Each structure stands twice: as structure tokens, then as C-alpha cells.
């Protein structure tokens, strides 16, 4: 469900926020996101 | 056989030291 504050737990991070599509450019190996803050900003979805 | 000539390596041998999507 996007667009929608949820209770995330993508492959083992717990978590809770809005999820929604991205135009990111995510290379074939990257999992994970992340700012110059260190914290978790984008998750790939394992099953899409 | 082969030879063990020296030289420089400049900029390179860099890799992606994770799998965490970085921008600007
Ligand atoms: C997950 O498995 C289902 C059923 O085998 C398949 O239809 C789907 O494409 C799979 N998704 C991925 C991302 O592998």
C-alpha cells in the first residue's frame, strides 16, 4: 500500500512511513537507500 | 615465461564498498 503511513518490514528492517514509486536509478546490486545522515531512505522490494 | 615490469596505478581500484543507494 503506498501513500499511506504503514508499519514496514522489508527482508528484516522494521520500520514505519509513506511508501510510493521512484524515478531512483538503483544499480542491479543496490538494496538498500540512505542520506549523508546514515538512515534508511529507499528499500528495494523483493517481490516486485 | 613472463616479465614483472613496474609502474603506476592513478585513480583506479575503486569499488562500491556496500550495496546503499547514494546521491548528491
Ligand atoms: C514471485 O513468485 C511468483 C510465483 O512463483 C512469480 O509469479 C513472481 O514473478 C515472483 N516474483 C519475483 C520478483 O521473482
Same mark, same amino acid.
Not at chain 2, 615465461?1 to 548528491?24: A, E, L, M
Given at each position: 500500500?503506498?501513500?499511506?503511513?504503514?508499519?514496514?518490514?522489508?527482508? /528484516?528492517?522494521? /520500520?514505519? /512511513?509513506?511508501?510510493?514509486?521512484?524515478?531512483?536509478?538503483?544499480?542491479?546490486?543496490?538494496?538498500? /537507500?540512505?542520506?549523508?545522515?546514515?538512515?534508511?531512505?529507499?528499500?528495494?522490494?523483493?517481490?516486485? | 615465461?613472463?616479465?614483472?615490469?613496474?609502474?603506476?596505478?592513478?585513480?583506479?581500484?575503486?569499488?562500491?564498498?556496500?550495496?546503499?543507494?547514494?546521491?548528491?
Amino acid at each position: 500500500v503506498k501513500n499511506k503511513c504503514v508499519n514496514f518490514n522489508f527482508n /528484516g528492517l522494521t /520500520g514505519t /512511513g509513506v511508501l510510493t514509486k521512484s524515478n531512483k536509478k538503483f544499480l542491479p546490486f543496490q538494496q538498500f /537507500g540512505r542520506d549523508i545522515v546514515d538512515t534508511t531512505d529507499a528499500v528495494r522490494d523483493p517481490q516486485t | 615465461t613472463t616479465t614483472q615490469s613496474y609502474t603506476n596505478s592513478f585513480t583506479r581500484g575503486v569499488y562500491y564498498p556496500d550495496k546503499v543507494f547514494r546521491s548528491s
